[PDB]
Amino acid sequence: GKALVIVESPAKAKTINKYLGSDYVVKSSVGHIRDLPRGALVNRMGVDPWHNWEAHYEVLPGKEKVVSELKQLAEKADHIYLATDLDREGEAIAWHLREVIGGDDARYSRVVFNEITKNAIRQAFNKPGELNIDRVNAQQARRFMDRVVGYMVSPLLWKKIARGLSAGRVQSVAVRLVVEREREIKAFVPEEFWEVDASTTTPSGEALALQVTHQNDKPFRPVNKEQTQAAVSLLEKARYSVLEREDKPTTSKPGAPFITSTLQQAASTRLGFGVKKTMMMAQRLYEAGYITYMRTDSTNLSQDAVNMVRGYISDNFGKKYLPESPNQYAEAHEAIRPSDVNVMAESLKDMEADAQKLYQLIWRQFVACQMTPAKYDSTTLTVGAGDFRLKARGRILRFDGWTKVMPALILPAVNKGDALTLVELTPAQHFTKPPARFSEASLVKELEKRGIGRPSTYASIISTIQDRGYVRVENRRFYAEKMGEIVTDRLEENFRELMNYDFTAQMENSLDQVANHEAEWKAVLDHFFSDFTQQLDKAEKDPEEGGMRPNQMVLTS
Ligand SMILES: Cc1cn([C@H]2C[C@H](OP(=O)(O)O)[C@@H](COP(=O)(O)O)O2)c(=O)[nH]c1=O
Numbered sequence: 001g002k003a004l005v006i007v008e009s010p011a012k013a014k015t016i017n018k019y020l021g022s023d024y025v026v027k028s029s030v031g032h033i034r035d036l037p038r039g040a041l042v043n044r045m046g047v048d049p050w051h052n053w054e055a056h057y058e059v060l061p062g063k064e065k066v067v068s069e070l071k072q073l074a075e076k077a078d079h080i081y082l083a084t085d086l087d088r089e090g091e092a093i094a095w096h097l098r099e100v101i102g103g104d105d106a107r108y109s110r111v112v113f114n115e116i117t118k119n120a121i122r123q124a125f126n127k128p129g130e131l132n133i134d135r136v137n138a139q140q141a142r143r144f145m146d147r148v149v150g151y152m153v154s155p156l157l158w159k160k161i162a163r164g165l166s167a168g169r170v171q172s173v174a175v176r177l178v179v180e181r182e183r184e185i186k187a188f189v190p191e192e193f194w195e196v197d198a199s200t201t202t203p204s205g206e207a208l209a210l211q212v213t214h215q216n217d218k219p220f221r222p223v224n225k226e227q228t229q230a231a232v233s234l235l236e237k238a239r240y241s242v243l244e245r246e247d248k249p250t251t252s253k254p255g256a257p258f259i260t261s262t263l264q265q266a267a268s269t270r271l272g273f274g275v276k277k278t279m280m281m282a283q284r285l286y287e288a289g290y291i292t293y294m295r296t297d298s299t300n301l302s303q304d305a306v307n308m309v310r311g312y313i314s315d316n317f318g319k320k321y322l323p324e325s326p327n328q329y330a331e332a333h334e335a336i337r338p339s340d341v342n343v344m345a346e347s348l349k350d351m352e353a354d355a356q357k358l359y360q361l362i363w364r365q366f367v368a369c370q371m372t373p374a375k376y377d378s379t380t381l382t383v384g385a386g387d388f389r390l391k392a393r394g395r396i397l398r399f400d401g402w403t404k405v406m407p408a409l410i411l412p413a414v415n416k417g418d419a420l421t422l423v424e425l426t427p428a429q430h431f432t433k434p435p436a437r438f439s440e441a442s443l444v445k446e447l448e449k450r451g452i453g454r455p456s457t458y459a460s461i462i463s464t465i466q467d468r469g470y471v472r473v474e475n476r477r478f479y480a481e482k483m484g485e486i487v488t489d490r491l492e493e494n495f496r497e498l499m500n501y502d503f504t505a506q507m508e509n510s511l512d513q514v515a516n517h518e519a520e521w522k523a524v525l526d527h528f529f530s531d532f533t534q535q536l537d538k539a540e541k542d543p544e545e546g547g548m549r550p551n552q553m554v555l556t557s
């Protein structure tokens with residue numbers, strides 16, 4: 001008569017089983033159990049846009065075994081707990097388990113937790129919740145419209161452009177961003193601008209480096225060899241002196257604990273990890289109960305989490321690193337942080353080196369976020385030389401603050417009015433450089449920025465656009481393929497709304513309204529499908545009627 005606890009993976013089962021008494025029987029479904037696959041089109045999609053979005057879910061291959069294994073486990077249990085992940089997909093999976101197993105809805109509870117620890121599991125089963133149909137509807141809505149775009153747009157692409165090509169509701173918009181970035185880079189015309197550095201000696205022979213900033217009180221920006229040399233000869237004869245000294249106490253505050261998007265960026269910048277790699281390892285860490293749920297865009301930290309880390313900072317770093325009050329970064333979810341701050345990367349049980357480095361990265365950002373600011377004494381020397389003004393910036397670390405948890409890593413003395421002796425002038429030619437190429441994690445950042453992605457879809461978006469001749473990662477950077485641009489233009493021309501960034505961001509909002517009972521999923525899908533078929537209908541017409549242009553290059557005749 002024990003309770004049945006269902007999770008989606010063996011790894012998560014093992015971890016949660018350590019925190020559930022013998023009264024519970026943990027069992028992983030190891031997969032989605034059930035899911036989707038002119039009536040022909042409807043059957044292929046498994047969803048019917050014409051019959052009020054009636055769906056057709058069938059158990060995945062070899063899962064009928066898992067199904068028949070769960071039912072009998074349920075008949076021996078007084079209650080079934082669906083402990084799927086906390087996001088919508090997880091809710092949907094919980095729904096699929098409750099549907100497939102059957103029985104009284106009262107026999108089912110929906111436990112929510114953002115980390116698999118003793119206390120988090122206790123709090124989750126002490127106040128078990130109900131399955132939220134709206135989050136399930138929100139998830140299915142997303143899924144249904146992705147199926148519609150993919151299965152209804154792709155065919156048009158095969159007929160008009162080339163067979164084998166794919167279309168993705170959000171994938172096509174992600175690609176568009178890369179394609180626009182590609183075109184920016186292709187059209188960019190580098191511009192030449194000069195800079196002039198001056199080496200000088202303070203009264204007491206100390207070396208001081210300055211860069212000219214003003215000439216005639218106007219920004220010094222020579223654009224060629226002659227203008228620079230002309231400025232150089234004026235500068236070689238000028239008398240140098242410190243027009244003014246400015247000593248200001250500055251500080252650098254630690255960043256907020258990680259959320260999905262920032263974790264990916266930092267893992268990509270500091271560890272060279274790609275999005276797929278970071279998310280796969282994040283999941284590994286989360287499922288082993290080492291970090292909080294890795295799909296979040298909430299920077300909140302629970303009081304226990306904050307008090308725990310503050311205890312760590314206090315014992316391991318000291319009073320000077322402990323802020324008076326806990327840092328508050330601005331839902332109900334939490335940031336990606338380690339579950340136990342006292343567990344070090346080196347102490348993780350079965351995690352490969354890279355998974356340890358990701359944890360370490362998460363741990364440090366977490367601890368640092370709750371530490372005091374670093375203090376520096378910033379100095380700004382402004383030097384006058386004839387009609388020129390030169391600058392020298394520098395700072396010395398007074399207190400490392402939060403930087404103490406990061407790996408271990410000089411303007412001379414001079415008073416206002418002191419004369420500087422010129423030693424050498426160094427003119428340097430530079431050129432404005434084209435916009436940086438998106439990186440996997442950098443594209444996500446842009447996606448988030450535009451409210452296009454979502455914690456649990458960012459990674460899927462990145463991968464899903466990568467193996468379809470549209471865009472490719474070369475040296476950890478995105479490059480737009482010819483087909484990518486060809487398709488992106490076709491879609492921009494005949495599926496404007498679908499390709500529009502705001503509308504795409506708005507759809508994410510529309511999905512949030514469904515998840516929050518502020519909109520009905522079918523009506524939302526109806527509206528999406530309405531705008532969609534209208535776009536699609538004109539796209540299918542001959543180009544002479546405003547239809548999509550075939551990817552052809554007609555000869556002279
Ligand atoms: C997570 C992490 C941060 N940091 C420091 C480097 C950055 O400071 P500087 O910009 O002053 O170099 C800052 C970046 O934080 P984020 O990774 O959150 O962006 O935190 C490390 O040195 N190593 C790490 O592994």
Ligand SMILES: Cc1cn([C@H]2C[C@H](O)[C@@H](COP(=O)(O)O)O2)c(=O)[nH]c1=O
Nearest residue numbers: 087088089090135454455456457515516
């Ligand atoms: C799994 C999944 C989750 N989510 C999200 C967004 C929110 O963080 C959370 C849903 O929670 P909410 O119902 O309380 O809004 O999960 C998506 O937007 N798409 C998905 O596919």
Ligand SMILES: Cc1cn([C@H]2C[C@H](O)[C@@H](COP(=O)(O)O)O2)c(=O)[nH]c1=O
Nearest residue numbers: 265268269270272436439441442475476
């Ligand atoms: C080209 C290159 C990028 N990167 C990174 C850092 C960032 O995570 C990402 C690109 O982001 P950025 O445009 O903000 O620099 O890829 C490396 O770590 N090494 C490299 O050699």
